[PDB]
Every structure is written in C-alpha cells, then in structure tokens.
C-alpha cells in the first residue's frame, strides 16, 4: 500500500511562487530518494532534480537550477518543490517519483502529478459560436472560446442528443481556454430539425444556448 500523494491542481498568478507537496506513506521515507519530473503534455518528461530524505542533499537538472528548490520534511514524510518567478510557460504536470536507490534502480512508484496552471485571468465566460458546414450524415459543432477557469459542460438538444457527440479537450490559448464539441446527425434531421448546443460555465455561472443554422 505504497502511496505518493500530490494535490491535483494549483492555480497561481504569474510572477509568484508555489510550494507543491508530495506526501509519502506505506514505506520508510528514508530508504528511498524522491525525484520530481515535469510533464508538458505533448512533450516528454523532463527530470527536474532529486532529494535524499536522510541528509536533505539535492542534485538538479542544470536547466532547473534556478527555477526549482527541493525540500523535505522527514517527520511528516513529505517532499516539497518550490517553483519561483512563474510564468504561463511553467504550466504543466509536475510529478514526484520514488527511486529504489539502495536496491534495484527504478522509479517504481509515482504520485498523480499536480497540474500547475499559471494565469493572470479571472473568471471569464465563454463565447459560443456555431459551426455549420460549408457545402447521409452531417457533422455540426460548437466553439466555446476564451473562457476561464475550467470546466464548461457541452450538451446537444439539452441532452436529447447523446450519440455521436464528441467533446474535445480544452487548450490554454493566452491565459484562456478554448474547446469545441461536435455532433453527427443524419442528413434529414438537419437543417430540417433544429440542432442546438448548450454551454454551461459554473465559475461564471453562464448558460448559453446556440442553435446551429446553415451558413
């Protein structure tokens, strides 16, 4: 029952710092080294550095030498990593991993990574725009652009339409997210029968309905 616990997400403003935690349980903190890794989704993993929990001794990736600081709190069995002078670009998943240093040399157990999002934006409601084609089954879609924070819920015909619905992952585009959703309806329903997409955005308490009409 080896476990490395990391908080799931963290929101910070640019120029500040964050102290990410990694609580270890089910093993003797001490017999293992703790490593930190950066995962930019769409790029590999980049090793940040390690810490020995016994002496507190660290080794860094020269690249991070000035962006990260590793620390340990032996008593509470937790590794920490501070990231300073944050900017949009530090957004990514940061994992903590254990390394069997005195034994077989593997990074056996990993924490679930903390998603760090660095952004200057404030709750910002989406701008839903309708995606009708240009030219049997037809695909319609909705663009939910420049909203913040995450998430938004997209529904077609208020739920009636649940088959052939694809809702894509959002992308952080200038401190703001963008996401789109599509539904494939037979060619007979549309445009005969109205297709309407519904976007709900909690943080900002918005609900927008947008009908997909040809154009």
């Amino acid at each position: 029952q080896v476990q490395l616990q990391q908080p799931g997400a963290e929101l910070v403003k640019p120029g500040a710092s964050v102290k990410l935690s990694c609580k270890a349980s089910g093993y003797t903190f001490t017999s293992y080294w703790m490593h930190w890794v950066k995962q930019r989704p769409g790029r590999g993993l980049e090793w940040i550095g390690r810490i020995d929990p016994n002496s507190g001794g660290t080794k860094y990736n020269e690249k991070f030498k000035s962006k990260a600081t590793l620390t340990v709190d032996k008593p509470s069995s937790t590794a920490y990593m501070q990231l300073s002078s944050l900017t949009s670009e530090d957004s990514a998943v940061y994992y903590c991993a254990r390394y069997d240093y005195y034994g077989s040399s593997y990074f056996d157990y990993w924490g679930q990574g903390t998603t760090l999002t660095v952004s200057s934006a404030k709750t910002t409601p989406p701008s839903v725009y309708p995606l009708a084609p240009g030219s049997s089954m037809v695909t319609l879609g909705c663009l939910v652009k420049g909203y913040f924070p995450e998430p938004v819920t997209v529904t077609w015909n208020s739920g009636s339409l649940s088959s052939g619905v694809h809702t894509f992952p959002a992308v952080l585009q200038s401190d703001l997210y963008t996401l789109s959703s599509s539904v494939t309806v037979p060619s007979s329903p549309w445009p005969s029968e109205t297709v309407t997409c519904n976007v709900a955005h909690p943080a900002s308490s918005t609900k927008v309905d947008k009908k997909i009409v040809p154009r």
Binding site: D108, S127, Y129, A132, T184
Partner: protein, 211 residues
C-alpha cells in the same frame, strides 16, 4: 546535454512479441546508464516497469523484460496484451542527471483499425464580427490513436497559428482530436484556400474549404 531517442509509435496485436528501444545520442547505452522503462496509462498514471537495465519492478508482469541490444537499451513485451496499450518512456542516467526519451506510443490492436472522420469548419460569421477567424478541424473515431495534422493555407503549409490537441480516448476505445488554425478577421479575407490534412495509419485525408 544528451538526447535519448525512442520509436514514436508501434502497433502490435495481442499475443505478439514487440521490442521498444532507447538510443543515446552520446554513444552506446551501457549498464552504467541504468536504463529505466516507465509506462504511462491514461489519466496521468505512471508506474515503473524495469530499472538498472533489467530489474523488473515488483508486480509488473513477466511478459516485460529489459536488456541491452546492440548499443541501446530495449524493453521486450513477450505476449503483448491489450492492456499494454500505453506510452512507454525510457530514462538513462548520465553520471549526474537523468534524461528521459520522448516515449513510444504502443497500440495492441483490441479492435480493427479505423480511419479518422475529419471535418473542417469555416470561421463562423459572428466570430468574423470580432475581427477573428478560427478554422476548426475535428478528427474522430480513429484507431490506432496516433495522427499527424497539417494545415495548408493557399497551398502553403501554415506553420504558426495552429494548435492540435492530444488524442483523447472515446468510449468505444477509438480516439479523437481537433486542431485549430487561428487567423485574424483579415488574414482570413486575404488567403483563399484552407485545408486540414490528417495522416493516419498511412492514408491521408485532406478536407478543404473555399472562401
């Protein structure tokens, strides 16, 4: 100051034997590089498989073994299973730091290959009223889950302006992804032919719009 290289994607069938490799840009990989193999399943789920070249982490099936083949570290899956479909990353030690490879996306055919369904939408008009234009290219139901999306404005490969999400697993176990090409109301009105080209398990699909 060393670059670990791995195959980009590999496709196999349940029951086969498949080998992934890990190459170092500085020289042959040796036992002092302590090759590690890590697996990433969906949901940011990491587990260690092998360490110190050939030590299998405890509770990792025996179908997994590591070794050095030639001048590189290798991971062999003997009797690949459907469950092994994931991203495998290798890590190499270099006297003072670790360098991770780019990872290999491995697909263990659990259903027949399926071509993507691509659709390109034009910037809507309410959006052209913002002095902005975004062409959305949606790609769904493809398997294996790996694609290449290339945009071409007026015959010319756009190279800036595009963003492509990472393949996400749908319910049926096929994947999806969308790519965005953001222009300005103006860039929009300038050029005349837009096209979203999707490359999947060797066939290409081009969906073009005409303004």
């Amino acid at each position: 100051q060393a670059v670990v290289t791995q195959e980009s994607a590999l496709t196999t069938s349940p029951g086969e034997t498949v080998t992934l490799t890990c190459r170092s840009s500085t020289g042959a990989v040796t036992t002092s590089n302590y090759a590690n193999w890590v697996q990433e399943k969906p949901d940011h789920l990491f587990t260690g498989l092998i360490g110190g070249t050939n030590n299998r982490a405890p509770g990792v099936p025996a179908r997994f073994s590591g070794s050095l083949i030639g001048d590189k570290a290798a991971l062999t899956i003997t009797g690949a299973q459907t469950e092994d479909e994931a991203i495998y990353f290798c890590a190499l030690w270099y006297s003072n730091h670790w360098v991770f490879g780019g990872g290999t996306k491995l697909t263990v055919l659990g259903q027949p290959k399926s071509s993507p369904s691509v659709t390109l939408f034009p910037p809507s008009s309410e959006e052209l009223e913002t002095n902005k234009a975004t062409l959305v290219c949606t790609i769904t139901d493809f398997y294996p889950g790996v694609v290449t999306v290339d945009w071409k404005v007026d015959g010319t490969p756009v190279t800036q302006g595009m963003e492509t999400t990472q393949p996400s697993k749908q319910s049926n176990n096929k994947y999806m992804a969308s790519s965005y090409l953001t222009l300005t109301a103006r860039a929009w009105e300038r050029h005349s032919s837009y096209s979203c080209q999707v490359t999947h398990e060797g066939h290409t699909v081009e969906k073009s719009l005409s303004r």
